[PDB]
Design an enzyme around this catalytic site. Structure first.
Site, PDB file in Angstrom:
ATOM      1  CE1 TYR A 190      10.822 -26.909 -42.737  1.00 10.22           C
ATOM      2  CE2 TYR A 190      10.568 -25.872 -44.884  1.00 10.22           C
ATOM      3  CZ  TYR A 190      10.854 -25.774 -43.535  1.00 10.22           C
ATOM      4  OH  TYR A 190      11.173 -24.545 -43.011  1.00 10.22           O
ATOM      5  CG  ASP A 240       7.816 -21.112 -39.648  1.00 10.40           C
ATOM      6  OD1 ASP A 240       8.248 -20.506 -40.637  1.00 10.40           O
ATOM      7  OD2 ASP A 240       8.035 -22.321 -39.426  1.00 10.40           O
ATOM      8  CB  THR A 255       2.036  -5.737   2.655  1.00 10.11           C
ATOM      9  OG1 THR A 255       0.753  -5.098   2.767  1.00 10.11           O
ATOM     10  CG2 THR A 255       1.859  -7.206   2.213  1.00 10.11           C
ATOM     11  CG  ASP A 260       2.719   4.363   2.358  1.00  8.83           C
ATOM     12  OD1 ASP A 260       3.069   3.229   2.756  1.00  8.83           O
ATOM     13  OD2 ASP A 260       1.519   4.714   2.246  1.00  8.83           O
ATOM     14  CG  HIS A 265      11.272 -16.418 -39.773  1.00 10.90           C
ATOM     15  ND1 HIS A 265      10.143 -16.747 -40.496  1.00 10.90           N
ATOM     16  CD2 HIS A 265      11.635 -17.478 -39.012  1.00 10.90           C
ATOM     17  CE1 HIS A 265       9.870 -17.999 -40.171  1.00 10.90           C
ATOM     18  NE2 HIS A 265      10.746 -18.479 -39.284  1.00 10.90           N
ATOM     19  CG  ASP A 281      -2.142   0.966   1.012  1.00 14.63           C
ATOM     20  OD1 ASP A 281      -2.978   0.733   0.111  1.00 14.63           O
ATOM     21  OD2 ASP A 281      -2.241   1.927   1.809  1.00 14.63           O
ATOM     22  CE1 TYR A 293      12.341 -22.692 -46.556  1.00 14.72           C
ATOM     23  CE2 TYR A 293      13.404 -20.869 -47.695  1.00 14.72           C
ATOM     24  CZ  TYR A 293      12.280 -21.424 -47.105  1.00 14.72           C
ATOM     25  OH  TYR A 293      11.099 -20.729 -47.060  1.00 14.72           O
TER      26      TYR A 293
HETATM   27  F1  LIG Z   1      15.186 -22.859 -43.252  1.00 15.70           F
HETATM   28  C1  LIG Z   1      15.638 -22.414 -42.046  1.00 15.70           C
HETATM   29  F2  LIG Z   1      15.265 -23.307 -41.087  1.00 15.70           F
HETATM   30  F3  LIG Z   1      16.992 -22.426 -42.124  1.00 15.70           F
HETATM   31  S1  LIG Z   1      15.050 -20.757 -41.635  1.00 15.70           S
HETATM   32  C2  LIG Z   1      13.336 -21.004 -41.990  1.00 15.70           C
HETATM   33  C3  LIG Z   1      12.888 -20.930 -43.292  1.00 15.70           C
HETATM   34  C4  LIG Z   1      11.553 -21.138 -43.571  1.00 15.70           C
HETATM   35  C5  LIG Z   1      10.639 -21.405 -42.568  1.00 15.70           C
HETATM   36  N1  LIG Z   1       9.264 -21.572 -42.822  1.00 15.70           N
HETATM   37  C6  LIG Z   1       8.662 -22.146 -43.963  1.00 15.70           C
HETATM   38  N2  LIG Z   1       9.422 -22.604 -44.964  1.00 15.70           N
HETATM   39  C7  LIG Z   1       8.780 -23.118 -46.015  1.00 15.70           C
HETATM   40  N3  LIG Z   1       7.464 -23.255 -46.189  1.00 15.70           N
HETATM   41  C8  LIG Z   1       6.713 -22.804 -45.174  1.00 15.70           C
HETATM   42  C9  LIG Z   1       5.334 -22.895 -45.247  1.00 15.70           C
HETATM   43  C10 LIG Z   1       4.529 -22.423 -44.233  1.00 15.70           C
HETATM   44  C11 LIG Z   1       5.101 -21.854 -43.116  1.00 15.70           C
HETATM   45  C12 LIG Z   1       6.472 -21.767 -43.020  1.00 15.70           C
HETATM   46  C13 LIG Z   1       7.279 -22.238 -44.036  1.00 15.70           C
HETATM   47  C14 LIG Z   1      11.102 -21.466 -41.266  1.00 15.70           C
HETATM   48  C15 LIG Z   1      12.438 -21.278 -40.977  1.00 15.70           C
END
Ligand SMILES: FC(F)(F)Sc1ccc(Nc2ncnc3ccccc23)cc1
Ligand SMILES: FC(F)(F)Sc1ccc(Nc2ncnc3ccccc23)cc1
EC number: 3.3.2.10
Lengths: 542, 542
Positions: B461, B334, B122, B184, B519, B10, B378
């Site tokens: 992926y 993501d 308190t 206080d 990102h 308080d 990638y």
């Molecule tokens: F690649 C790394 F890991 F080196 S950095 C990196 C690069 C890419 C993503 N996200 C997505 N990539 C490809 N298709 C998607 C489709 C939908 C959502 C995310 C993705 C995450 C990290």
């Protein structure tokens, strides 16, 4: 010979049927007979309703496509529609008024318990209305009771197309002759008939159930009141919270809404609330069924002082703290009930409401020590560390089978335990299985007690003096938060009579009583425990 | 030399002071000056207020004992009190209007981060009012930020009795000269002074903070905006749900209210939401931060087909099913964002609201395969099972330090990864520590990836064709449930431009944007992520 049962949702597992509402609306609004049903099935397999049932479109996308189909159907009838007309409004009430057909679910439940593979087969849509939850809640309740749920909008097939019927068979992994199918629509019934499945047209639940019990050879109609839904441990969400360096607490969590914290007694488990967990979650509560300190998957420190009321309560507060809960309703049984009254007297701001099963709230005598308040032979037997542990841990199956029994099954003696030298002195080595428990249910308690035994649980009895000194700090207080005391007629340890003066310290105290009920309240009288708790939660706990 | 800081509640950590309200009420109701304050401290150490502060009596027990003390104090003043006068009413608003003094907490936070042992001392009561939760919520928020909380009604001692001051020292395990005390009230300040503690009278936060930074030798006033509160993994509630025989899902859970399900991206953890979890729970939400399939404490099956959108989504529905949740708001980043859009398109009845960070909703091309839609180097590098796994698992510390970096820190190349043959080809073996992450925070991700590596995450992926065929069933639908798209200016993978046509499929789509954000959205710009999500949750998710 049958081994599979298939039910429709609309008109079979859920009443009144949504389809029938299209007719009622015409009859109420004095519209040409069938107007709304003509607009509904317009275009047949190429129409908006088929696209909706196959999952091509959502419910909110279909609503206008139906309103303009109500505009096309009225041009052929020449009459015009009213001002306060809304297709959304009709369907909203229709979906809302549709509730589970309890006898049909009971029959499905009974067939599954007799080793049948049960499934729901429905023509449904992807519901994206603002009020879609009511239906999501309904589907949640029904689905748990079945092996499979085949929704047309998910499978992309629909009734009466024969593809969904061959999909039904492949899912069930059974020959059509091993399958009973139930539908309120003859059209959606014919392809199952053609494949060689047993079919039951549903017009009224009683006749439909008669046809079902006739063909299955199992009593489904007029059958005794079933036990509330129980918990399969492996199908539960298990939670873990470290309340301090060496102490971790485990709980099983189910439902959304106000937090309801369930506290078991000695020698129990979160599993002692097996029939309350699904029920209370269904009533709109977030159930947190605890494994109290020393039990199951919770930490079992060896030291006696670790189990006094002050540390146990302070630890339950840290549990709330780490979970992000400012308040929870505390429901306790046996030693859990004791804990729960101390939670109310020491941390009322953390307790939404307080409920006790069998355990009364008895204020401590500041003059006389609790070791005198002799005025509970087993209590003295539990004082010596190691003695009771060795007896209770000797044969776990025996221990629970001897303890866990109804008032009409009593085989255990609480009187003259010390002079006879043992809790099970005048008890069989192979006790009979009580009417409250299954062999499997007893094995769960055996498996749990194999982790850390009875030291932890027994220490709850070894802090009489500490608990007494602590409780004496609360002698000037009154419990003024919502409170419920539930007495069990035939509990010979925690007798209803002991609760008589509770209103002197809890003026607004609400009460509940269960006739022909033993000490193990929850498994003895589940239906009535749930009835009492839900009614009190809904009125005093929001 | 100091190492401990002690704050009152308080008037120090919470403003306006409840005590000051007794004066304001006299001034508003034109009552003889001090009337209510004379009734308050009546009887001194033998009076109702001392009994309340020592925990002898609860707040609801004290309310009448104060009203009759207002009757005794008016007899000496000869005047009579009004008709609409309520002691409960005055205290209810007083407690309600009292909010955290944010600069004082910031200073306490800063001292603790500099290795100080912080504590709240308190004079409080046991609150049993119907509206006690507001205060329980307040105490919850403050307490987490301190090493100790000494409440008078718990310890049975009170300020200014010297016993609580020796209790304060024994708790802190420090010499009085190593202690700064802040109050206080001069009276409650004197015994700390006498013992040899540094004392600061609080009249205005700025001067009090000046005195604090003067004596501590640490910048506390005018200091840059602090990061939102983070999560200590071991202090969290960890939840486990078996969604199917071989698949278990783990989540961290915090708060009460509507269920908010947080879905991380690749290669992440529930920990990627570390700054959102406490914030969203504080906003009145039940946060469920997931470990997605293949990550951390969740199951990581080896098979590719286990990670296609259909199985991943169906598994998240089973998660809701087993937890007893009909609906949850799905917030995804993501790959989590992708999942979250499919949850909305296939199970809208299970989604209260849908939010995505960086990930746009792009409807599948039914003509062109996703392996062509080359039009993401990638992606191709991740197609071959084993290749990327071996590189990413080679040095975990390197992998995350190279990946987890701001737009102004960029060291990783997404372009020409395949021809160069590796993600980290033109990258240091010992990368610098990014401004977004601490060494300890990177080690958490290292420890988690040591369990099952990159096979599971990378399989997300490896289902391009399955996801495409599945998504094509949703080409006729529109997302009509509440939806939020949050774009990050400097995300070079998931670029804001890609989201432009999203309103064609989500008409009511709400939007959010973050400037100078990479990102890794959540750790890059936490304060603004929380600001955007809380504002959208409060308006569109109830
Ligand atoms: F690649 C790394 F890991 F080196 S950095 C990196 C690069 C890419 C993503 N996200 C997505 N990539 C490809 N298709 C998607 C489709 C939908 C959502 C995310 C993705 C995450 C990290
Ligand atoms: F003793 C067994 F285990 F064989 S049966 C049995 C016998 C007694 C209790 N509960 C309590 N006992 C003593 N003080 C209490 C104080 C508060 C609450 C429960 C109790 C449980 C099981």
């Amino acid at each position: 010979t049958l081994r599979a049962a298939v039910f429709d949702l609309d008109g079979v597992l859920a009443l009144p049927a949504v389809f029938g509402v299209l007719g009622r609306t015409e009859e109420a609004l004095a519209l040409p007979r069938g107007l709304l049903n003509d607009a509904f099935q317009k275009g047949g397999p190429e129409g908006a309703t088929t696209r909706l049932m196959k999952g091509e479109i959502t419910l909110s996308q279909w609503i206008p496509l139906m309103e303009e189909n109500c505009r096309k159907c009225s041009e052929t009838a020449k009459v015009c529609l009213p001002k306060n007309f809304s297709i959304k409004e009709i369907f909203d009430k229709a979906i809302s008024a549709r509730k589970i057909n309890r006898p049909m679910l009971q029959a499905a439940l009974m067939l599954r318990k007799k080793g049948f593979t049960t499934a729901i087969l429905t023509n449904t849509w992807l519901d994206d209305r603002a009020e879609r939850d009511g239906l999501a809640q309904l589907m949640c309740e029904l689905k748990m009771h079945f092996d499979f749920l085949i929704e047309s909008c998910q499978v992309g097939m629909v009734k009466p197309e024969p593809q969904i019927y061959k999909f039904l068979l492949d899912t069930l992994k059974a020959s059509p002759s091993e399958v009973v199918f139930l539908d309120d629509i003859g059209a959606n019934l014919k392809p199952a008939r053609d494949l060689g499945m047993v079919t039951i047209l549903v017009q009224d639940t009683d006749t439909a159930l008669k046809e079902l019990e006739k063909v299955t050879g199992i009593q489904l109609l007029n059958t005794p009141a079933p036990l509330p839904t129980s918990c399969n441990p492996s199908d539960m969400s298990h939670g873990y919270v470290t309340v301090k360096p060496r102490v971790r607490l485990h709980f099983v969590e189910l439902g959304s809404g106000p937090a309801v914290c369930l506290c078991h007694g000695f020698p129990e488990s979160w599993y002692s609330w097996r029939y309350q967990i699904p029920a209370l979650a269904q009533a709109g509560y977030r159930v947190l069924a605890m494994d109290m300190k020393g039990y199951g998957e919770s930490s079992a420190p060896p030291e006696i002082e670790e189990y006094c009321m002050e540390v146990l309560c302070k630890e339950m507060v840290t549990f709330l703290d780490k979970l992000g809960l400012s308040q929870a309703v505390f429901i306790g049984h046996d030693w859990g009930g004791m804990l729960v009254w101390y939670m109310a007297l020491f941390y009322p701001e953390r307790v939404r409401a307080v409920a006790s099963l069998n355990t009364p709230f008895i204020p401590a005598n500041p003059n006389m020590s609790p070791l005198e308040s002799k005025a509970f032979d087993y209590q003295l037997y539990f004082q010596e560390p190691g003695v009771a542990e060795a007896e209770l841990e000797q044969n776990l199956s025996r221990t629970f089978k001897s303890l866990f029994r109804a008032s009409d099954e009593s085989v255990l003696s609480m009187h003259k335990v010390c002079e006879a030298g043992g809790l099970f002195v005048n008890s069989p080595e192979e006790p009979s299985l009580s009417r409250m428990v299954t062999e499997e249910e007893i094995q769960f308690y055996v498996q749990q007690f194999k982790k850390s035994g009875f030291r932890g649980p027994l220490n709850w009895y070894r802090n009489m003096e500490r608990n007494w000194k602590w409780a004496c700090k609360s002698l000037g207080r009154k419990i003024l938060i919502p409170a419920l005391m539930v007495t069990a007629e035939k509990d010979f340890v925690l007798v209803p009579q002991m609760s008589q003066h509770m209103e002197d310290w809890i003026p607004h105290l609400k009460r509940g009583h269960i006739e022909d009920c033993g000490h193990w309240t929850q498994m003895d009288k589940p239906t009535e425990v749930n009835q009492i708790l839900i009614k009190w939660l809904d009125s005093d706990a929001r």
